[PDB]
Amino acid sequence: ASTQGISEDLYNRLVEMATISQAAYADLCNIPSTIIKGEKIYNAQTDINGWILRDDTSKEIITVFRGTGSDTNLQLDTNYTLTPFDTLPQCNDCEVHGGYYIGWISVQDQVESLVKQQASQYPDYALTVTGHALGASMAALTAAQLSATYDNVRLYTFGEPRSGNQAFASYMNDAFQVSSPETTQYFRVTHSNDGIPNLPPADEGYAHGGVEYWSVDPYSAQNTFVCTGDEVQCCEAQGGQGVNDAHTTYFGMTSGACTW
């Protein structure tokens, strides 16, 4: 359930999305030069933040969600109450992170309006959803919803908490071709002993979807494992707890400042 090292191509990509995610906490800092900064996703009450972006070179429309950036967002973080994903009925028996569902429904229509706004102009462009931490769970639920409308949807998360229950994980796995890593459209990136991917407890009914990409220090394509299956391994097995050093820094870039 683990293979060490990934292509140099995939590594760059992961580093690329990590960058965009980490920059979402500082007004999309120094994101690649080929991407256009677009419409702002925002709901002052849940303080959900994010942007719809477009890269005409890679031919993809990117949707970024910032991670916890306030006390308001933190209220969302702490709420582990399981709740049905009623916005996507076709996801049989699926239940997601309560606080994150709260954030999700607070922007769903806004998020779907803006996504469609770009997709309607660029039918052939791929749709990528990404984010770090709370922003990562916000991406997963978004990806899932989008999956039922568009076909070319990709998800790249970072330090993503367990966003829902096993049911939710299956839908995601089937929706994003997780059965195989060579075909996966859902990349769940983890780092060292990051504590967030261990929350909330699996015991409480939560579970992870997607194929895991565990970045180990010193980070590099060769120090990145491909974790598949259901056996305690990689990040989930390092015993990381809550928000620690590993969580805030992915591929040498921290959420705050813009080292990049």
Ligand X SMILES: COc1cc(/C=C/C(=O)O)ccc1O
Which x/- pattern, by CB under 6 A, does the window 167-206 give for ligand X? -----------------------------x--x-------
Reference 105, options 87, 78, 117, 131; nearest CA is: 87
Among 11, 25, 51, 101, binds ligand NAG (CB under 6 A): 101
**Taken in order 149, 190, 36, 103, is the CA torsion positive or negative?**
positive
Q: Does 134 bind ligand X (CB under 6 A)?
A: yes
Is residue 72 within 8 Å of residue 46, measured between CB atoms? yes
Ramachandran quadrant class, 81 (left: phi over 0; alpha: psi -120 to 50; beta: rest): beta
- Please work out the total of residues on this chain that contact ligand NDG, with binding judged by CB under 6 A: 2
Task: Find the shortest distance in angstroms from Cβ 105 to ligand NAG.
Answer: 8
Residues, the chain: 260
Q: Does 2 bind ligand NDG (CB under 6 A)?
A: no
**Are the C-beta atoms of 53 and 37 separated by less than 8 Å?**
yes
For position 177 contacting ligand NAG by CB under 6 A, the verdict is no
Among 47, 55, 77, 95, binds ligand X (CB under 6 A): 77
Choose among 113, 118, 117: nearest CA to 142. Answer: 113
Using CB under 6 A as the binding rule, the residues of this chain from 119 to 158 that contact ligand NAG are none
For ligand NDG, what does the binding mask look like between residues 33 and 72, x meaning CB under 6 A? ----------------------------------------
Surface-to-core class of residue 223, CB atoms within 10 Å of its CB (0-12 exposed, 13-18 middle, 19+ buried): middle
Nearest CB to ligand NDG, comparing residues 110 and 177: 110
Distance CA 144, CA 129 (A): 10
Among 43, 58, 83, 233, binds ligand NDG (CB under 6 A): 83
Instruction: Confirm or reject binding of residue 104 to ligand NDG (CB under 6 A).
Output: no
The smaller minimum CB distance to ligand X, of residues 67 and 181, is found at: 67
Nearest-angstrom CA–CA distance, 28 and 39: 12
Residues that bind ligand NDG (CB under 6 A): 83, 101
Q: What residues make contact with ligand NAG under the rule CB under 6 A?
A: 79, 81, 83, 98-99, 101-102
